[PDB]
Design an enzyme around this catalytic site. Structure first.
Site, PDB file in Angstrom:
ATOM      1  N   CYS A   1      11.110   0.847  15.022  1.00 30.27           N
ATOM      2  CA  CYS A   1      10.704   0.072  13.866  1.00 30.27           C
ATOM      3  C   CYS A   1      10.609  -1.363  13.530  1.00 30.27           C
ATOM      4  CB  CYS A   1      11.651   1.523  12.509  1.00 30.27           C
ATOM      5  SG  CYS A   1      11.002   0.793  10.899  1.00 30.27           S
TER       6      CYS A   1
ATOM      7  N   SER B   1      12.310  -2.594  10.972  1.00 24.67           N
ATOM      8  CA  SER B   1      13.848  -2.931  11.095  1.00 24.67           C
ATOM      9  C   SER B   1      14.486  -2.818  12.747  1.00 24.67           C
ATOM     10  CB  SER B   1      14.073  -2.294  10.136  1.00 24.67           C
ATOM     11  OG  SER B   1      13.481  -1.564   9.134  1.00 24.67           O
TER      12      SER B   1
ATOM     13  N   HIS C   1      14.120  -6.500  13.723  1.00 30.64           N
ATOM     14  CA  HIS C   1      15.073  -7.821  12.285  1.00 30.64           C
ATOM     15  C   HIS C   1      16.873  -7.262  12.682  1.00 30.64           C
ATOM     16  CE1 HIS C   1      11.579  -7.335   9.505  1.00 30.64           C
ATOM     17  NE2 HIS C   1      12.061  -6.469   8.864  1.00 30.64           N
TER      18      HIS C   1
ATOM     19  N   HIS D   1      17.162   3.615  15.079  1.00 29.48           N
ATOM     20  CA  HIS D   1      17.654   4.335  13.898  1.00 29.48           C
ATOM     21  C   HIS D   1      16.509   5.426  14.351  1.00 29.48           C
ATOM     22  CE1 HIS D   1      15.139   1.265  12.510  1.00 29.48           C
ATOM     23  NE2 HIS D   1      14.980   1.754  11.817  1.00 29.48           N
TER      24      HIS D   1
ATOM     25  N   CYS E   1      12.230   8.208   9.919  1.00 27.88           N
ATOM     26  CA  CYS E   1      12.289   6.416   8.953  1.00 27.88           C
ATOM     27  C   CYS E   1      11.234   6.265   9.230  1.00 27.88           C
ATOM     28  CB  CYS E   1      12.914   5.003  10.139  1.00 27.88           C
ATOM     29  SG  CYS E   1      13.082   4.047   8.837  1.00 27.88           S
TER      30      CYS E   1
HETATM   31  N1  LIG Z   1      13.575   0.577   2.532  1.00 21.56           N
HETATM   32  C1  LIG Z   1      12.962   1.135   3.916  1.00 21.56           C
HETATM   33  O1  LIG Z   1      14.465   2.573   3.737  1.00 21.56           O
HETATM   34  C2  LIG Z   1      12.572   1.024   4.703  1.00 21.56           C
HETATM   35  C3  LIG Z   1      12.729   1.807   6.118  1.00 21.56           C
HETATM   36  C4  LIG Z   1      11.880   0.990   6.967  1.00 21.56           C
HETATM   37  C5  LIG Z   1      11.322   0.430   7.309  1.00 21.56           C
HETATM   38  N2  LIG Z   1      11.739  -0.855   6.130  1.00 21.56           N
HETATM   39  C6  LIG Z   1      10.901  -2.120   6.546  1.00 21.56           C
HETATM   40  O2  LIG Z   1       9.776  -2.108   5.501  1.00 21.56           O
HETATM   41  C7  LIG Z   1       8.887  -3.549   6.404  1.00 21.56           C
HETATM   42  C8  LIG Z   1       7.322  -2.794   7.276  1.00 21.56           C
HETATM   43  O3  LIG Z   1       8.198  -2.005   8.854  1.00 21.56           O
HETATM   44  P1  LIG Z   1       7.189  -1.689   9.807  1.00 21.56           P
HETATM   45  O4  LIG Z   1       7.805  -1.081  10.447  1.00 21.56           O
HETATM   46  O5  LIG Z   1       5.895  -0.736   9.495  1.00 21.56           O
HETATM   47  O6  LIG Z   1       6.954  -2.840   9.880  1.00 21.56           O
HETATM   48  P2  LIG Z   1       5.285  -3.576  10.653  1.00 21.56           P
HETATM   49  O7  LIG Z   1       5.546  -4.257  11.339  1.00 21.56           O
HETATM   50  O8  LIG Z   1       4.586  -2.368  11.167  1.00 21.56           O
HETATM   51  O9  LIG Z   1       4.259  -3.534   9.541  1.00 21.56           O
HETATM   52  C9  LIG Z   1       4.413  -4.766   8.293  1.00 21.56           C
HETATM   53  C10 LIG Z   1       3.105  -5.108   8.121  1.00 21.56           C
HETATM   54  O10 LIG Z   1       2.798  -6.667   7.309  1.00 21.56           O
HETATM   55  C11 LIG Z   1       1.870  -7.233   7.459  1.00 21.56           C
HETATM   56  N3  LIG Z   1       2.612  -8.781   6.957  1.00 21.56           N
HETATM   57  C12 LIG Z   1       2.946  -9.539   7.743  1.00 21.56           C
HETATM   58  N4  LIG Z   1       3.001 -10.710   7.209  1.00 21.56           N
HETATM   59  C13 LIG Z   1       1.929 -10.703   5.959  1.00 21.56           C
HETATM   60  C14 LIG Z   1       2.039 -12.054   4.674  1.00 21.56           C
HETATM   61  N5  LIG Z   1       2.715 -12.575   4.796  1.00 21.56           N
HETATM   62  N6  LIG Z   1       1.198 -10.699   4.230  1.00 21.56           N
HETATM   63  C15 LIG Z   1       0.375  -9.872   4.200  1.00 21.56           C
HETATM   64  N7  LIG Z   1       0.656  -9.203   5.357  1.00 21.56           N
HETATM   65  C16 LIG Z   1       1.807  -9.552   5.704  1.00 21.56           C
HETATM   66  C17 LIG Z   1       1.689  -7.254   9.242  1.00 21.56           C
HETATM   67  O11 LIG Z   1       0.474  -7.792  10.114  1.00 21.56           O
HETATM   68  C18 LIG Z   1       1.657  -5.850   9.598  1.00 21.56           C
HETATM   69  O12 LIG Z   1       1.142  -5.334  10.024  1.00 21.56           O
HETATM   70  C19 LIG Z   1       9.875  -3.582   7.134  1.00 21.56           C
HETATM   71  O13 LIG Z   1      10.864  -4.572   6.436  1.00 21.56           O
HETATM   72  C20 LIG Z   1      11.047  -2.892   7.483  1.00 21.56           C
HETATM   73  O14 LIG Z   1      12.318  -3.647   7.674  1.00 21.56           O
HETATM   74  C21 LIG Z   1      12.422  -0.080   5.258  1.00 21.56           C
HETATM   75 ZN   LIG Z   2      12.642   1.690  10.146  1.00 23.61          ZN
END
Ligand SMILES: NC(=O)c1ccc[n+]([C@@H]2O[C@H](COP(=O)([O-])OP(=O)(O)OC[C@H]3O[C@@H](n4cnc5c(N)ncnc54)[C@H](O)[C@@H]3O)[C@@H](O)[C@H]2O)c1
Ligand SMILES: [Zn+2]
Ligand SMILES: NC(=O)c1ccc[n+]([C@@H]2O[C@H](COP(=O)([O-])OP(=O)(O)OC[C@H]3O[C@@H](n4cnc5c(N)ncnc54)[C@H](O)[C@@H]3O)[C@@H](O)[C@H]2O)c1
Ligand SMILES: [Zn+2]
Ligand SMILES: [Zn+2]
Ligand SMILES: [Zn+2]
Lengths: 374, 374
Positions: A46, A48, A51, A67, A174
């Site tokens: 993920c 995260s 991160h 996770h 997740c």
């Molecule tokens: N709230 C929650 O419970 C929770 C749980 C899971 C993930 N997260 C968060 O959600 C987010 C997404 O996770 P993921 O695993 O899908 O990540 P990921 O990196 O696979 O996807 C993020 C996408 O954002 C796009 N992107 C990056 N910068 C950009 C910008 N400036 N403008 C437009 N697009 C942009 C990327 O090209 C990518 O495709 C992360 O920040 C993660 O930490 C939150």
């Molecule tokens: Zn996650």
């Protein structure tokens, strides 16, 4: 026999920020009272977890991250009543104690026993079950799935169907649940609506799946990586836009496309600027915007509260709003009943030893979810 | 008879920011098609009218302000079908055109014909019905109720009960409805909940009334002017707190008092800092905070989006979320049936000619609502 004994096994230890994971032997203590030791079967990568590496998400180091996972219970501590050795389980990065004011609230899911708000990187009892080269190693969100074995608190594990395919349902731990619930539970996307989804990774694709399930008429994917568009359309996006293709701010573009603003928007990236953009692009009188992405630690956004005074609703959530222990088994059952698809999220399947390669795939833009198999 | 003729009458003209109103003769043109000329009977002094003076709320000057009022129709333009000469009416500072996407939406009320978001200070047709000293004078929110006579677009007026006491129900034109609806419609306060209301002026008192009507168990009034507490308790506050009395920030105080955060909070002041404080004091997983106060023009607040990611909902609204033309007559009927009280809001009465004293009363902290009679 391993029950009651320390297990020596392989894990991916992150000793400091901005380093590759170090795959090496760790020692995993047996579970204490109300704890559960799990043999890992599959874990997803993920954003995260990345991160933690990049210092976007602060948690105590050194750590065993991970996770989003599924495994099989190896042993249980005294007093455990909800799982047994041999059960298939998903670790719950958001606990469900069942007893705190949040767990008792009809809407709430962010149980007060969580280790996300103010991370300590321990078990509930304030100690660690992991050692590596004689040093204590922190836990991550009460899960720590980048290890052949982990120990979790009972409130942080859910029993799932004995027949479930763990190399797929780990995503219910997740990314899938987060995105899907953000649409169907948190935003409560309506039939016939227009949605905008910022970020087309595993979580954002899962938001699209939820918006489609909810009957949205239009689902506009937004990503700066156009390679993400094809899959977004496959899972339900009706249109995709790359902000870098436009001379004007994308909130203006999206407002124009939606004839005055979208019904629902989702920030699924983790940037302060896209959080404000996503709010702005929803219709000013009745739009709803949900923050899903995790942005850089300790940074505040700037916004004009007139965006809210006109009538917008801004919300965020962890884990799609789902009460974790209640919801995870039902979501697995729903998957087994073909109610949603997980394969579209899975672009790569690697052995666990190839964790760094999996992270490189994420960072390069090439993967959605890599599933690591033990 | 004055129908079809220019009316010379007295109005309170604001020629310059930060100056007293000038009570002097204006010329009020007759109504054009789909316009209504109203003989004003009573108008309240809302803090937003003072925001025009102070430059907090930007609208073109010179202007006839006033937006919380009631009167009697003097004449109607061609095509008007919803009111007739002699009808009691309340001008609507938020129109209800009935045709735009907001008016058609079940939840929306901030009609796209409004003159709040980007004020022009005109009638719908882009022209003014007012002259003073031979100079055209701007309208305010399509209402301009600080005048013996005004002209409003038909979408900006509602007919009300012929037996209505206009010196009371003028408050339904802004402050009462705003505060009441913010609680019962926008927040949807639940029975047994704990609410915090920041700002105990006419609008905040009306929020308290709505929280009481909704069955809240605890309603915590927050104001830096402790002289506001007695009336707040009279209308339903269970406790009141003055941030100035505490060594800790009031969000911390309120979280402690509510055993982990309030269910619903309301910002009813107009300060960026209290908007962030009000959000923070609601429970992190399931709390809701509603912005009602109008803050200084063009200023951004700074906040950490982790406040939302845990589960909070942040929203704002104009006019309590009420669709104005549908709701105002129903609110007046409810008042006539004693479903809520307006007398507790009315602390002072003055003739219109003493408008500047009424603003002094507001600015000194002494009044809630002063009602001006024509
Ligand atoms: N709230 C929650 O419970 C929770 C749980 C899971 C993930 N997260 C968060 O959600 C987010 C997404 O996770 P993921 O695993 O899908 O990540 P990921 O990196 O696979 O996807 C993020 C996408 O954002 C796009 N992107 C990056 N910068 C950009 C910008 N400036 N403008 C437009 N697009 C942009 C990327 O090209 C990518 O495709 C992360 O920040 C993660 O930490 C939150
Ligand atoms: Zn996650
Ligand atoms: N959203 C809407 O449709 C709408 C309609 C009506 C009024 N408004 C706005 O609502 C707000 C309230 O209007 P009102 O007529 O009740 O005003 P008011 O001035 O009578 O009441 C505001 C109260 O806030 C208190 N206060 C001021 N600064 C404070 C601080 N730093 N901390 C705590 N308390 C503080 C004051 O002592 C006062 O009692 C204004 O900003 C007004 O412009 C909005
Ligand atoms: Zn709990
Ligand atoms: Zn007002
Ligand atoms: Zn309209």
């Amino acid at each position: 026999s391993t029950a009651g004994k320390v297990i020596k096994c392989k894990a991916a230890v992150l000793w400091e920020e901005k380093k590759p994971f170090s795959i090496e032997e760790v020692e995993v203590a047996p579970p204490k009272a109300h704890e559960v030791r799990i043999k890992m079967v599959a874990t997803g990568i993920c954003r995260s977890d990345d991160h933690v590496v990049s210092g976007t998400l602060v948690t105590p180091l050194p750590v065993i991250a991970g996770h989003e996972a599924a495994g099989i219970v190896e042993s249980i501590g005294e007093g455990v009543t909800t799982v047994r050795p041999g059960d298939k389980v998903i670790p719950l990065f958001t606990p469900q104690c069942g007893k705190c004011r949040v767990c008792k609230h009809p809407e709430g899911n962010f149980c007060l026993k969580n280790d996300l708000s103010m991370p300590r990187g321990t078990m509930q009892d304030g100690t660690s079950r992991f050692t590596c080269r004689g040093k204590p190693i922190h836990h991550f969100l009460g899960t720590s799935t980048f290890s052949q074995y982990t120990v979790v608190d009972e409130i942080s594990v859910a029993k799932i169907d004995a027949a479930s395919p763990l190399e797929k349902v780990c995503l219910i731990g997740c990314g899938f649940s987060t995105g899907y619930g953000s649409a169907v539970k948190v935003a409560k996307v309506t039939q016939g609506s227009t949605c905008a989804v910022f970020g087309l990774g595993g979580v954002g694709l899962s938001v699209i799946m939820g918006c489609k399930a909810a009957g949205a008429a239009r689902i506009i994917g937004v990503d700066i990586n156009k390679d993400k568009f094809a899959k977004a359309k496959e899972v339900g996006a009706t249109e995709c836009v790359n902000p870098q293709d436009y001379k004007k701010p994308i909130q203006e573009v999206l407002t124009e496309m939606s004839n005055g603003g979208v019904d629902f928007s989702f920030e699924v990236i983790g940037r302060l600027d896209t959080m404000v953009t996503a709010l702005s692009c929803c219709q000013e009188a009745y739009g709803v915007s949900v923050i899903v992405g995790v942005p850089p630690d300790s940074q505040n956004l700037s916004m004009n509260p007139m965006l809210l005074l006109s009538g917008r609703t801004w919300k965020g959530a962890i884990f799609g709003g789902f009460k974790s222990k209640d919801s995870v088994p039902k979501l697995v059952a729903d998957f087994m009943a073909k109610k949603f698809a997980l394969d579209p999220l899975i672009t790569h399947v690697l052995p666990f030893e190839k964790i760094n390669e999996g992270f490189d795939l994420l960072r390069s833009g090439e993967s959605i979810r890599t599933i690591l198999t033990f």
